[PDB]
Amino acid sequence: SAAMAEQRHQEWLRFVDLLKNAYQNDLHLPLLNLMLTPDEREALGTRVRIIEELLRGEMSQRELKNELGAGIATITRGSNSLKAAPVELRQWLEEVLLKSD
């Protein structure tokens, strides 16, 4: 249903915009503690590390599984989503997540 998809999209943007405003008001931490579960906070921290290591290029995917405790399916999702991302985002992530050499 296109109508239901439109409703889901509007609801998602409401979250995005709410959080934007929370950051501007220094309310982001309490908002994220309200809106997410502990397990989802843990998952998001792990996903940042997966991205950082995929961009770095030192560890193979099976080495990452072993080192981070994340399964191969999880790592593969990360890799495919990173390959699909806009170049501008990948370039920015390389600037922010990796140390200068």
Place this chain on the structure above:
Amino acid sequence: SAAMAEQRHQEWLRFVDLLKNAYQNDLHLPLLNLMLTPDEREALGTRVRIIEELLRGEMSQRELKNELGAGIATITRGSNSLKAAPVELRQWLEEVLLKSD
């Protein structure tokens, strides 16, 4: 383990700070599409609606289940987390999520 808890906390803050910076650079939407699954975007949109309706106070919890398709367990989590939240956050959410009367 306190040491592992410290590691999880650091990783979570890295996400929080990454997203802060993404918003400042207008990269928030692509970052959130990279970092979250579709089902997690849907869940976050639904949770904003649950919070909005709990603060409004018009619908009972069983009415919300019926109207939003969310289970009673999900609504109860929302309600308990809202009651636990800092007053300043609740007050701000009332200002932003509800229309002026």
